[PDB]
Amino acid sequence: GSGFLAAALERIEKNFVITDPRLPDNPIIFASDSFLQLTEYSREEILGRNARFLQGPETDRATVRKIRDAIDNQTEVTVQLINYTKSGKKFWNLFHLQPMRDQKGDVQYFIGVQLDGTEHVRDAAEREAVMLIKKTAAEIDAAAKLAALKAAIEAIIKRIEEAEKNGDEDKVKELREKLDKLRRAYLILALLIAALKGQIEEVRRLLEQGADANGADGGGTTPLHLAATSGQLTIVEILLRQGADVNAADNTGTTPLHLAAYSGHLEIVEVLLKHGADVDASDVFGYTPLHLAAYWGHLEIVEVLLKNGADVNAMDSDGMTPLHLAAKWGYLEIVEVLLKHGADVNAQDKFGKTPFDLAIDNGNEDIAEVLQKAA
Ligand SMILES: Cc1cc2nc3c(=O)[nH]c(=O)nc-3n(C[C@H](O)[C@H](O)[C@H](O)COP(=O)(O)O)c2cc1C
Numbered sequence: 364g365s366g367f368l369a370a371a372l373e374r375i376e377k378n379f380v381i382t383d384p385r386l387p388d389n390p391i392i393f394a395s396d397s398f399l400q401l402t403e404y405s406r407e408e409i410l411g412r413n414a415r416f417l418q419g420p421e422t423d424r425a426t427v428r429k430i431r432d433a434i435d436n437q438t439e440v441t442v443q444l445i446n447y448t449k450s451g452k453k454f455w456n457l458f459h460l461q462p463m464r465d466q467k468g469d470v471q472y473f474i475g476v477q478l479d480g481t482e483h484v485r486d487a488a489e490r491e492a493v494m495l496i497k498k499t500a501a502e503i504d505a506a507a508k509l510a511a512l513k514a515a516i517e518a519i520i521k522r523i524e525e526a527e528k529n530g531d532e533d534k535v536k537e538l539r540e541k542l543d544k545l546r547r548a549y550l551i552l553a554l555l556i557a558a559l560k561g562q563i564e565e566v567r568r569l570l571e572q573g574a575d576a577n578g579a580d581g582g583g584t585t586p587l588h589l590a591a592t593s594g595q596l597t598i599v600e601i602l603l604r605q606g607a608d609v610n611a612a613d614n615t616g617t618t619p620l621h622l623a624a625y626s627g628h629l630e631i632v633e634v635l636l637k638h639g640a641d642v643d644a645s646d647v648f649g650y651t652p653l654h655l656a657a658y659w660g661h662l663e664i665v666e667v668l669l670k671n672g673a674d675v676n677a678m679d680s681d682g683m684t685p686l687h688l689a690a691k692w693g694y695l696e697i698v699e700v701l702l703k704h705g706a707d708v709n710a711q712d713k714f715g716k717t718p719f720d721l722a723i724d725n726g727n728e729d730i731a732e733v734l735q736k737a738a
């Protein structure tokens with residue numbers, strides 16, 4: 364167990380567990396009440412155990428290895444697998460692993476969100492749920508991050524009272540300069556969470572009280588990046604009125620407009636471009652918002668992005684255009700709309716591949732046909 368996490372994450376009420384990778388076998392150190400309900404095991408029967416108890420016979424051993432690979436490689440993963448309750452009642456798990464990292468970027472804990480379904484969901488319904496569990500794990504991370512900052516404040520306030528009572532002014536002078544940075548950072552994260560959760564009055568209040576509208580976490584995330592990812596037009600507009608940088612880039616070169624194209628929030632994209640967003644801004648991998656629109660199945664956003672200056676033949680780090688990503692993931696309607704707006708069918712990726720090659724390689728037999736016909 365762990366009393367620190369217990370306090371911060373007690374209000375979430377979604378199925379999730381936190382595990383300690385520093386202890387043998389990554390045991391569960393916190394389990395939500397919703398998880399406890401879903402699985403039927405008590406908190407005592409769960410804590411200190413590796414979460415593989417939920418596994419059973421109809422559980423795809425190949426999908427389980429995808430999770431071992433993600434834990435081992437310390438990356439996030441979203442999979443769908445059959446899980447079993449304490450009783451033996453089978454149920455579908457849309458599972459999301461997310462490493463909890465510190466400011467130096469090192470893993471501290473693992474977050475595991477579970478979304479119970481009666482059947483293996485697919486296509487737009489899978490994408491709708493995957494976006495939602497990703498947003499849940501993002502909030503569990505921020506809830507712990509804020510709780511950690513609150514704790515540091517109460518701790519230095521405690522040290523301040525002792526040093527004041529000890530006479531020692533040199534210590535108080537020195538402690539107050541550290542507190543003045545914890546307070547500084549607390550409001551930066553308070554505003555980052557307010558945009559993420561869509562709390563319009565919290566956003567106005569913090570900015571009204573002095574919060575920097577461009578204050579970013581250690582990773583480069585500004586409130587405008589989180590408001591864009593969430594689908595909060597009002598907060599976006601409030602942040603842009605209060606002079607926020609519409610072309611801000613995080614440690615990964617991602618701009619609010621990349622996150623708006625990835626999340627499928629059409630209205631936000633239009634407002635960001637209406638305020639000076641670079642339609643051809645490229646992240647560390649070379650993806651422009653057009654590449655993110657194409658890979659994620661956002662039909663509507665591509666038509667708007669191209670109308671503002673998007674290069675329909677943009678090359679990511681592996682020489683792939685939007686016309687490539689459309690055919691690899693088998694989104695039929697997307698390849699048609701992309702090719703319509705003059706996209707190169709004979710475009711050379713790193714392996715010299717063209718849309719048709721990545722369509723026959725991935726089994727998409729309809730797509731590969733509306734490529735040799737549509738050429
Ligand atoms: C935070 C966290 C939550 C987990 N939740 C589940 C879960 O809901 N269901 C499941 O079957 N495995 C879950 N796992 C994965 C397993 O614990 C384990 O990593 C997996 O079975 C692969 O490793 P193994 O082959 O040693 O079992 C979770 C792991 C972590 C890190």
Ligand SMILES: [Mg+2]
Nearest residue numbers: 388389413434
């Ligand atoms: Mg494990």
